[PDB]
Ligand binder design. Structure first.
Ligand code: CL
Ligand code: CL
Ligand code: MG
Ligand code: MG
Lengths: 51, 144, 53, 144, 106, 144, 143, 145, 150
RNA sequence: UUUUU
RNA sequence: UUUUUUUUUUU
RNA sequence: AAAAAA
RNA sequence: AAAAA
RNA sequence: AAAAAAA
RNA sequence: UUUUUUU
RNA sequence: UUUUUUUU
RNA sequence: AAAAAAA
RNA sequence: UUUU
RNA sequence: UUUUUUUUU
RNA sequence: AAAAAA
RNA sequence: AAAAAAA
RNA sequence: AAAAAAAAA
RNA sequence: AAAAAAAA
């Protein structure tokens, strides 16, 4: 391989500094994606009629 | 599987939240001048074009940058990123250069968990430096 | 259908739901309706599980 | 293997159908302008150039796009796809950008099984946005 | 054109339903074919999102025997239909066709 | 699978074909005269009623025949098939009879791989002899 | 079983009064010195082979033997050049005799892709030899 | 894959050849039968250009099978009987088959044992055929030589 | 110990027997590369006679069994366009209506596509015959044909 | 390897 | 990281 | 085997 | 069990 | 051993 | 995965 | 191994 | 790829 | 348990 | 794995 | 099998 | 296996 | 359910 | 099961 550019990522899952991300080609993007949600809202009913 | 409606034997009313969090990967562009750094504003993430205009704060996790336009004549594209923090800006210049003049230049940096706090629209994400006039950004963040 | 639930305690809510099968999971715009709600109470709370696109 | 004809001990007249279905990937081009979306019509799939002039309906499964012409000067190619449905048009903008100026920009989306209904010539598949003047489309569908 | 309203009837206990999801449609010739002919029956599936052009045909190998054929509706096309809608077209050399439609009333 | 559209990370433009092949079974009927053989034309396969009017050649793999109408009085139905080729016509008479007067008479033959060349509309498939005046055919072939 | 037994026959089966029959047809041809002779396919259809009821045949392999003695001081040889309607070949499969009193043999096999039918007007192959006659054995499928 | 060109055969000495070999066949042909009368099936019916067998003068019959070719009389079911005949001695068996449906053919057959599988020339008779149908279809598994 | 021998330094004798079966003009499997001129919107029929040439050592053949055809664009495409190429197989028993198309995802990169002929359609073709039609936005296309000369 | 039954 | 044909010693 | 540390 | 580096 | 090819 | 009859 | 038999 | 089954 |  | 052709319980 | 990521 | 049905 | 077509992402 | 001819 080679030698180092010192990004001190301590123990991998426990770094306390910013670490360089070796990015590549521009990915597939979507600024307006989907969203699965559970929407809570109230509706008003009368006694004997449907709504 | 089932082809008609089926009853759901629901019970007590559950814990709800009409305005939950959202983990996203926001793509947007910024203009960059030659030899000048551009402080990427956090407010660029809050927009109706990203469905995030209902938020006021966001937790940035990683930042990635590509060159959106062609470099000057005879040069290879490059891009730099300097992480900015309200508790103290950094001095790293995570630089990425292209090996083909016709190809973009890409680079990024990951934010440590200890430096993942909320940021408002007035704040800035990072400084960007490039020989190209535009930089394509994709920021992995947490809207809350 | 009239998927109905009744509260066994006068102080407790009455609950009932229904799941839409996969063959009937198309899109619905604002001008559309979801279901008809009947109750002896003046207000009913709804928690709709859906996918926004 | 053999070298001459062989007798087939046939039985009752089977179930026949002179006009069956056909799963295809239809390649055709559309003209797109800068900053404006083009609604790709389903009628483009029915033509004698695809052996589908006998079908009146089709079930689209997945749609793929490719920039068919070169991007403007100093820019990289991109292409957006907004899925359209008769029960309710979407707002997604699946976008793919080219990392090389001389290379196409590719993106695509898959229609879920719950949304795979028939579409006639009057209907539209998706909206296509691109900085390139034309876009190549390969639509995996089921003609019926 | 076979109307969906033929499924909502008191003769089937279904006069309380207004919509139905059809799964599979199979048809049998109900009367004898013309002279010198073997029976046949065709089915062209119809949908509100797009009519089809398939002619699922079945023929009888014996002139004294019915001709039968059917088609299955995929899960992605199993939506509701009301009385104003049509299930499919029927073509045959016989003057009546018996249909046994497997559906889900709701 | 899911209930919403998903993004496809498409790559380079694929190798496409707008007019592909199609293997089918084509049901079509022919009229036969008493004591007279009838040559089956290959042009009967190419038709808008079979979705094959876009093809000009076809490779036939097998032929199957049924008596379409009733036989003469006191007789049981029979049908013969004599294969034909442009390199040389055959003399085989693959004959099938009915054991019940009301039942169709059926027979079929298979073409070996070495004899599976293309045939145009001007060519002929086989000869059909029968005491009935109509014979139904279901030919398994490859349109190209 | 030394007596007739009963066969419980069922429905009428599929019949074919004129089947295909696979054969190995032997015949001879006259050859001149230096001249190549085209072997006609029509020789395969003859009452001497029980094949006068056939009009087509699928050839699979051809084998050749010298039928007469070679010229003086020479050893027998024979060459075969395959011929097709889609295009003639230029191969000359040759076999020579290591004994003057012994025949010469050679043969070629027709691949599956080239095993189409041939009528009487066609030709099988070209034969060259120093002997004035050649004996051919053609493994073919009549139909 | 398969070979796509002509390939040389390394043939040797001239082999044993035979231009007029034998042929195991199943010959289909029809015969006309009257009511209450038995029709002797001639062996010469097997030798014809319609069967590619006019070059054979003898044949060794192995088994015979019959089917009624025409409809039976009114209100009756089809039947057919077969009586094996040999030059060394005619049998007296009447292998009969009846149709359980008036619209269906009647069928029956008989197998010849290897000891009785000699040759028969055109002037010989295979069997006798009785039936209430005016025509019978015959399928004879035999070995031509 | 003493059994090492496959590297000969001098001539050795060959104990030959009877005269073998010989063929002075045998077959040959090849991959013939050549180019053709293509016009815009016009289909060019590729002649089989292009295979029989002294430039390929195949000028002695008169027939060939084509197995597969591959095509690459030989010149640059028009301005703003990516290269493409199409192929339509042709047969003496009946021409095909398929147009196997392969485009270029890079304007500077060739466009490639090819098709394989099935065993049932691998017959001989003489010089007067044609292999396939070729369409391309480029003015020249390069071909490589895997074929069996005979 | 090369030369020999 | 996997083949059809020109000759070809040796197990 | 650099510089930090249950 | 034989030879020739 | 020599002629398509294949990631 | 039964086998027996001429190229 | 010849003619009648026994749960599709 | 031809005769009488293919369980 | 009712269906084709 | 799915759409149409052929095989086999 | 949604949307993010050694 | 889907739907309706008892603890 | 032979080919053509998304992929186990 | 079946009289007849056989059969360590
Ligand atoms: Cl300029
Ligand atoms: Cl030495
Ligand atoms: Mg309440
Ligand atoms: Mg009867």
């Amino acid at each position: 391989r080679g030698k180092v550019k010192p990004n001190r990522k301590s123990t991998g899952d426990n770094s306390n500094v910013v670490t360089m991300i070796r990015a590549g080609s521009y990915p597939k993007v979507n600024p307006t994606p989907t969203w699965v949600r559970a929407i809570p809202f109230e509706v008003s009913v009368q006694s004997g009629i449907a709504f | 599987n089932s082809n008609v409606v089926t009853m759901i034997r629901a019970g007590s009313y559950p814990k709800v939240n009409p305005t939950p969090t959202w983990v996203r990967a926001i793509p947007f562009e910024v203009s960059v001048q030659s030899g000048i750094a551009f402080k990427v504003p956090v407010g660029s993430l809050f927009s109706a074009n990203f469905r995030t205009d209902s938020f006021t704060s966001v937790t940035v996790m990683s930042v990635r940058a590509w060159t959106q336009l062609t470099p000057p004549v005879n040069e290879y594209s490059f891009v730099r990123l300097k992480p900015l923090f309200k508790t103290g800006d950094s001095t790293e210049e995570f630089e990425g250069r292209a090996s083909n003049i016709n190809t973009r230049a890409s680079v990024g940096y990951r934010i440590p968990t200890n430096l993942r706090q909320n940021t408002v629209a007035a704040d800035n994400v990072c400084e960007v430096r490039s020989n190209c006039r535009q930089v394509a950004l994709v920021i992995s963040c947490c809207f809350n």
